[PDB]
């Protein structure tokens, strides 16, 4: 039969679409090339930051405050005689005051998709200037050395505060009067208990948006620390491609894979779909429990302090 006439009618219209879509991409692309080239030129000159180290010092932040540390700027601590004092950022305001910030996000200023060592050593900017003022009172995203973090906790009872907020302002947080990460020799485990506060016990009770085997497989508590440079997830598979850390770019105490992904991919706006994730998963700092698997926070922080 005579069905041929549809060729001159159908094919063309598609040709028009492909032309639009394809041509739109070529320019869209040349657009990015200009940016990458340009941004590249900028990193030929790093940022300068000057932080006058306060005289007051101690082991953690708790000691400092009880030592005349009222202002909330970066300090210099030393939790042990056999370790070099390092910089850090002490929050002396939030709830009682005297919390030792261990990790923080707020603008994606520093990528957290680093290898294992960086996470062991520590990376990011402890703190930046305060609009002219010689000292550094502003934060800036980072992750102090694991070994330190472990060493910190493994020397007295400790607790944690994981505040955060969306792009609506609304804030929430978690509280564990019992935090402890093991030494590098033990893949930096993480034994957290004693939940509190409102935001979601997505660190020991798994995710709320799941049930049974699905949920109980998202409990960070007692897991090991993994990086796309070294796999220690609860995801047992042979495909090198399939690993929590590679999926959701970044080091964390993954477990097939997370109920909360701090240290993820700081996205903008706050929302995002699967067809944007680097791998197609749901990377990026998201608590999920308070918001959902598709929503990276505007600010994510963690801080420690003794139990007493």
């Amino acid at each position: 039969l005579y069905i041929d006439e549809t060729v001159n009618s159908n094919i063309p219209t598609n040709l028009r679409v492909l032309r639009s879509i394809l041509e739109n991409l070529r320019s869209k692309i040349q657009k990015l090339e200009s940016d990458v080239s340009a941004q590249m030129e900028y990193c030929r000159t790093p940022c300068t930051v000057s932080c006058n180290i306060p005289v007051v010092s101690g082991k953690e932040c708790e000691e400092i405050i009880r030592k005349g540390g009222e202002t909330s700027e970066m300090y210099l601590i030393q939790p042990d005689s056999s370790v070099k004092p390092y910089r850090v950022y002490c929050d002396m305001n939030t709830e009682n005051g005297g919390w030792t910030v261990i990790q923080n996000r707020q603008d994606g200023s520093v990528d957290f998709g680093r290898k294992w060592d960086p996470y062991k050593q520590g990376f990011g900017n402890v703190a930046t200037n305060t609009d002219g003022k010689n000292y550094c009172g502003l934060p800036g995203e980072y992750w102090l050395g694991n070994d330190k973090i472990s060493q910190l906790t493994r020397m007295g009872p400790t607790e944690l505060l994981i505040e955060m907020e969306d792009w609506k302002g609304d804030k929430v947080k978690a509280h564990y009067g019992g935090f402890t990460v093991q030494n590098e020799a033990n893949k930096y485990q993480i034994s957290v208990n004693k939940y509190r506060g409102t935001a979601g016990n997505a660190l020991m009770d798994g995710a709320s948006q799941l049930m049974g085997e699905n949920r109980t497989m998202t409990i960070h508590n007692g897991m090991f620390f993994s990086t796309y440079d070294r796999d220690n997830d609860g995801w047992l598979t042979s495909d090198p491609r399939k690993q929590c850390s590679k999926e959701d770019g970044g080091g964390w105490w993954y477990n097939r894979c997370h109920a909360a992904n701090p240290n993820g991919r700081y996205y903008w706006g706050g929302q995002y779909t699967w067809d944007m994730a680097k791998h197609g998963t749901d990377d990026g700092v998201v608590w999920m429990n308070w918001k959902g698997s598709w929503y990276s926070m505007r600010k994510m922080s963690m801080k420690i302090r003794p139990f007493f």
């Binding site: 799941l210 085997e213 497989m217 995801w235 894979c257 998963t281």
Partner: peptide, 5 residues
């Protein structure tokens, strides 16, 4: 984002 069986 979990990984089913």
């Amino acid at each position: 984002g979990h990984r089913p069986y």
